[PDB]
Design a binder for this molecule. Structure first.
Ligand SMILES: CN(C)CCCN1c2ccccc2Sc2ccc(Cl)cc21
Lengths: 218, 108, 213
């Protein structure tokens, strides 16, 4: 079975370069063209450039010519793309893919390398409890946790060590300053809060951070 | 056999089998398959000793071979388009690389 | 450059219904169009090649037709795993180009958002920060506008928004909106309002709180 193996993430400083790998297996490497495709968060696919591993002949989207350098290492059956002078515009997922034999549908795809361009250092999140305080019926209370100013992604958010699950919305992180912020809501019967404890648990593996924040009225 | 294509200092390599080449899209693959007979199957080069490295040899081998092939083709009243020259460049480069490797080895 | 125009940009469908979407090319490309499916946070996957040719391991419910400039992908009966973005791509000539994509979503009954507003925590206020949070949960359809007001005056600065993907169980959407102010700026005012304009009502839903209280 053909596999295309790409590194999951790269964190890179603005102005720096990154060289991302796509390691192929399960077929004759030199028999098929390899392709690179960009996808900005929430946006569509953009072709960057393609390479023939037999002789390293390349073709580029004109916009990437001078920006993306495509090479292969035949010995390790590996295709590489080097991106230089990175900016926030380069923050994206980069896929490699492989076409057919003399046919150019992209038959196999790597899982993509997620590139984040930032000069931020590793920063644990500040975790703030979001409590109503007031008159709010439904028999349903909504509580929340604000997870502010961390880097890099990801954080993991649970409620009551995962024992809460049915009414939780954890939103995708957003860029705030040079750092990430996310929020999570949990909707629960008014019996159970504040009668019993509702706690949000926030793990930030990169900073070896693990914080429990009990939601307290007022 | 009979490489000395003097000249001029240039030499003519032996004929090589034409490789299957894929150009990365549907139109060019077809164009190539149909037109590849119009392109060289041997290269002109200067003796390998006269070059600093492979890239230098290859670059010159490509230009000399294409130039010479172009004059012979114009004499026959035929013309190369920009696609022809891009494709010729690639396949002649492959042949020049092979020629260099064989010429470079010739040191035994 | 061959431009590929895909329409519509979003298609709402009911499970089991037969759906189609279109890709049109600015120049004739023969049959050199290929279709890809991309589910949330996954790689694209080839589903039809060269206009109409099936792919090993792809369900037979997928088909394509067309030749020249006008292409169509059809799904005979949509399993829920088909909810995804769909892209066409041409490989006739350089540069390769992609369509802008068509998003598939599940059709459900319209549902107004459940709106909750939260003042800054004492904890955050202690650090000189003030974030006002508004959750707009479980609404449909996806389109929604949020406006912030402070003491009656609208504000479009220091506002960060975030959206969830369509819920796998109830097919609804949720949004988070956070207004961040300096603790000092925040104290200069009393009333804070999150204001949601949704299709479900011509009257915007207003949630607000007064510091004096
Ligand atoms: C284009 N310009 C450099 C003139 C080249 C003409 N040329 C050439 C030059 C000087 C002395 C003898 C020759 S014969 C010959 C054989 C093969 C090739 Cl490739 C060229 C030449």
């Amino acid at each position: 079975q053909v596999q295309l193996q790409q590194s999951g993430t790269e964190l890179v400083m603005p102005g720096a370069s990154v060289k991302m790998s796509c390691k192929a297996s399960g077929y004759t490497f030199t028999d098929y063209w390899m392709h690179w495709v960009k996808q900005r968060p929430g946006q569509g696919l953009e072709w960057i450039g393609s390479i023939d591993p037999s002789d390293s002949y390349t073709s580029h989207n004109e916009k990437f010519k001078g920006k993306a350098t495509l090479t292969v290492d035949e010995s390790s059956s590996t295709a590489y793309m080097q991106l230089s002078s990175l900016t926030s515009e380069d923050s994206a997922v980069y896929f490699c893919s492989r076409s057919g034999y003399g046919y150019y549908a992209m038959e196999y795809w790597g899982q993509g390398t997620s590139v984040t361009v930032s000069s931020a250092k590793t920063t644990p999140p500040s975790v703030y409890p979001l409590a109503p305080g007031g008159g709010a019926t439904n028999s349903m209370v909504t509580l929340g946790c604000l997870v502010k100013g961390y880097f890099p992604e990801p954080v993991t958010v649970t409620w009551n060590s995962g024992s809460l699950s049915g009414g939780v919305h954890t939103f995708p992180a957003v860029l705030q300053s040079d750092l990430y912020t996310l929020s999570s809501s949990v909707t629960v019967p008014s019996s159970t809060w504040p009668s019993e404890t509702v706690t949000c648990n926030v793990a930030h593996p990169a900073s070896s951070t693990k914080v429990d924040k009990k939601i307290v009225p007022r | 056999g009979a490489v000395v294509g003097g000249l001029g200092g240039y030499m003519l390599g032996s004929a090589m089998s034409r490789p299957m080449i894929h150009f990365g899209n549907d139109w060019e693959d077809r164009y190539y398959r149909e037109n590849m007979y119009r392109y060289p199957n041997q290269v002109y080069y200067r003796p390998v000793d006269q070059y600093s490295n492979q890239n230098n040899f290859v670059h010159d081998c490509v230009n000399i071979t294409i130039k010479q092939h172009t004059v012979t083709t114009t004499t026959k009243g035929e013309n190369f388009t920009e696609t022809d020259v891009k494709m010729m460049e690639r396949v002649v480069e492959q042949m020049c690389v092979t020629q260099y490797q064989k010429e470079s080895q010739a040191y035994y | 450059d061959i431009v590929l125009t895909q329409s519509p940009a979003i298609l709402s469908v009911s499970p089991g219904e037969r759906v189609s979407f279109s890709c049109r090319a600015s120049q004739n490309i023969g049959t050199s169009i290929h279709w890809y499916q991309q589910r949330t946070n996954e790689s694209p996957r080839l589903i039809i090649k060269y206009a109409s040719e099936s792919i090993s391991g792809i369900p037979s419910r997928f088909s394509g037709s067309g030749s020249g400039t006008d292409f169509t992908l059809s799904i005979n009966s949509v399993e829920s795993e088909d909810i995804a973005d769909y892209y066409c791509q041409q490989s006739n000539t350089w540069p390769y180009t992609f369509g802008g994509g068509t998003k598939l979503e599940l059709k459900r009954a319209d549902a107004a958002p459940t709106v909750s507003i939260f003042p800054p925590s004492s904890e955050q206020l202690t650090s000189g920060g003030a974030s006002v949070v508004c959750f707009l949960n479980n609404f449909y359809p996806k389109d929604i506008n949020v406006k912030w007001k402070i003491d009656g005056s609208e504000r479009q600065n220091g506002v960060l928004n975030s959206e969830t993907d369509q819920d796998s169980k109830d097919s609804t959407y949720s949004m988070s909106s956070t207004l961040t102010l300096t603790k000092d700026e925040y104290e200069r005012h009393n009333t804070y309002t999150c204001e949601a304009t949704h299709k479900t009502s011509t009257s915007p839903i207003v949630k607000s709180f007064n510091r004096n209280e």
